[PDB]
C-alpha cells in the first residue's frame, strides 16, 4: 500500500474502535506501521485525516453503487432499489470496520460535521437521479405525481435507515441473526411500494 | 395561574428562545413574575426544570391525541391516520413556542437527554396500538403480514417526522407557506398506503 493508503486504512480501524474524540495520530501511526511524524506529511491535522477517511470509504460505497447500476440498470425500478438494499445490507455485514468507522460521525466535533454531512448527500445523487428518471416509465396510480412518488421514497428510505442504524449500530451478530428476517421485509415492503404507487 | 404553572410556562418561552445551555433560571423567575428563590421551591434545578417543561408539553399532545381519538375512533385506519397528520400539523402552525422548545431537546446535557428520550416513546405508545388494532380490520395485501404492515408505517413516519424537522424547524413562515401543498402531498402518500397494504 502506499503510505498515504496504509494511513487511511489505519484511521478507519482506530477511529472505529476508539471514536473520534479518543483516537489519537500516534495510535494511527504505530498500526499503520509508519513513523508518527508521517501523519502530519500527509495530513494537515486528526480533523483532515479523519475528513479523507470518511470520504475515501464514501467513495468505496459509491463505487458499489455504480457497478450495481450498470448491471441492474434495466430492471423495474422496483425490483432495482429491493435488490441494491440487499446488496447495501450485505455489505455492510462484511464490511463491519467501514460500519463501525462510519457511525463515529455523530459525535464528530460540530465544526467539522457540519462540514462532512453534506459531502454524503452529494454522494447520494446518481440514487435519486436514477429513481427520479426511472418512475417516468411507470404508470403511476391516479394522484400519484413523480414529485409525491419521490418524495415518498426518500422519506420512507430515510426512517429506514435511522431504524436501522438505531438498531444495528455496533451490534454486528444481531444483524446477522436478523438478516434473512429483514431480507424477506424488504421484498414485502417494496412491493407494498409498487402496489401503492401504480395502477 | 398556580406558581409552577406559571414558571413551567415561562421555562417553555425562556428555554425556546435561549435555548437548553444559554436560558438562566433568573430569566425564566423574571419571565414568570416570581421571586428568584421560587424556583427552587419546585423545582431542583435548571435540569428537572427543563425535564418538567418537557414532560408538561408532551402531556398536552398526548391530550389532543386522546381527543382526537375518542372523536375519529371509527374511521378506516388510512383515513384516521392521514387526519391526524393535518390535526398535528395545524397545532405544530397554531403552537409555535411549543414547537421551538421541543426541538431544544438536540442540544441537552446528555445525561437529561438520554433520560428523556425514552418518555417520549412511552407517550406514542397509545397511537400504534390503536393501529396494530385497526390493522385487524382490514383485508391486507397478499404478504403483507399485520407486523410488516405495522413496521412499514413506523419506518415511514420516523422518516416524515425526521425531514420535517429538518426542514420546518425555526422557520413558522415557510411552514405557512408550504401547509397547503403539505396536506395535499400528505393526502396522497396516505392514498398510496392503503392501496399497496390492501387487497
Not at 470518511?54 to 453503487?65: G, H, P, R
Given at each position: 500500500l502506499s503510505k498515504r493508503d496504509a494511513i487511511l486504512k489505519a484511521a478507519v480501524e482506530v477511529f472505529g474502535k476508539k471514536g473520534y474524540d479518543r483516537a489519537t495520530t500516534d495510535e494511527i501511526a504505530e498500526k499503520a506501521g509508519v513513523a508518527k511524524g508521517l501523519i502530519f506529511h500527509y495530513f494537515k491535522n486528526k480533523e483532515e485525516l479523519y475528513y479523507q477517511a470518511?470520504?475515501?470509504?464514501?467513495?468505496?460505497?459509491?463505487?458499489?453503487?455504480e457497478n450495481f447500476l450498470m448491471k441492474n440498470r434495466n430492471r423495474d425500478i422496483f425490483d432495482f432499489m429491493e435488490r441494491w438494499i440487499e446488496k447495501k445490507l450485505e455489505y455492510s455485514?462484511?464490511?463491519?470496520?467501514?460500519?463501525?468507522?462510519?457511525?463515529?460521525?455523530?459525535?464528530v466535533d460540530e465544526g467539522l460535521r457540519k462540514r462532512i454531512l453534506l459531502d454524503l448527500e452529494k454522494s447520494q445523487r446518481v440514487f435519486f437521479d436514477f429513481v427520479r428518471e426511472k418512475l417516468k416509465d411507470l404508470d403511476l396510480a391516479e394522484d400519484v405525481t413523480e414529485e409525491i412518488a419521490l418524495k415518498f421514497l426518500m422519506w420512507f428510505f430515510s426512517g429506514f435507515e435511522e431504524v436501522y442504524l438505531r438498531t444495528y449500530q455496533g451490534k454486528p451478530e444481531l444483524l446477522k441473526r436478523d438478516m434473512n428476517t429483514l431480507v424477506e421485509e424488504v421484498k414485502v415492503m417494496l412491493?407494498?411500494?409498487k402496489k401503492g404507487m401504480t395502477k
Open positions: 470518511y470520504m475515501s470509504v464514501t467513495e468505496k460505497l459509491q463505487k458499489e453503487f455485514a462484511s464490511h463491519p470496520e467501514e460500519a463501525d468507522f462510519l457511525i463515529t460521525l455523530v459525535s412491493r407494498i411500494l
